[PDB]
Structures are given as C-alpha cells and as structure tokens.
C-alpha cells in the first residue's frame, strides 16, 4: 500500500497506488469505475 | 476577482491509468504541456 505498483486482477490491468477506501464490494462485484468510467478499484479474486 | 487555484495534470486527465494511451499522447508533442499551460494560464490570468 501507499506505493505505485502495477495491478492485474481478473484482467483489469493498470498502474496505480493501492489504498483502502470505503468501497464495499459484494461477492458478485468485480471492479469499481470512477466518474470517467475507468477502473479505479479492484478486488483480490483469491481471497475477498 | 479571481478563481480557485487548481492543477490539472494533462497526462492523467487525457490518459487515466493507461499505458498505450500515453504512448500515442506523446506523439502529439507539446499539446499535453499546452493543456497544463492553458488551465494554469487561466489561473495565472486571474492572478493578473
């Protein structure tokens, strides 16, 4: 966390800084989108 | 009299977490820097 790293979760590739937000991803939700309809939040598929 | 001071990054704005986007954006030349100087120039113009 708090470091610029490359993410790869269920094909949602990209580069960003990992942080902890209040996003409550349900068991079915894959990834979150920002105002620009771009991936801004993902979930570890191995463990919730 | 003036507006609120802001700093919008041309690279992240045009290309939100995308590597291939930045590769083609750099081919356009200084239009990225002009976007920063444009929005910043407005803020500097309000300071004038």
From Swiss-Prot, chain B:
Q: List the disulfide bonds.
A: 10-32, 15-21
Origin: domain of life: Viruses
* Role noted for this protein: Precursor of the fusion protein processed in the biosynthesis of the S protein and the formation of virus particle. Mediates fusion of the virion and cellular membranes by functioning as a class I viral fusion protein. Contains two viral fusion peptides that are unmasked after cleavage. The S2/S2' cleavage occurs during virus entry at the cell membrane by host TMPRSS2 or during endocytosis by host CSTL.
Q: Provide the protein name.
A: Spike protein S2
**Natural source organism:** Severe acute respiratory syndrome coronavirus 2 (2019-nCoV)
Q: What is the lineage of its organism?
A: Viruses, Riboviria, Orthornavirae, Pisuviricota, Pisoniviricetes
């Amino acid at each position: 966390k708090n470091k610029c790293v490359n993410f790869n979760f269920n094909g949602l590739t990209g580069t960003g800084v990992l942080t902890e937000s209040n996003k409550k991803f349900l068991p079915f939700q894959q990834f979150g989108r920002d105002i620009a309809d771009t991936t801004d939040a993902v979930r570890d598929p191995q463990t919730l | 009299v003036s507006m609120t001071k802001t700093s919008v990054d041309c690279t992240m704005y045009i290309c939100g977490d995308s590597t291939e986007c930045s590769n083609l954006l750099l081919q356009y030349g200084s239009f990225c820097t002009q976007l920063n100087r444009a929005l910043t120039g407005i803020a500097v113009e309000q300071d004038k």
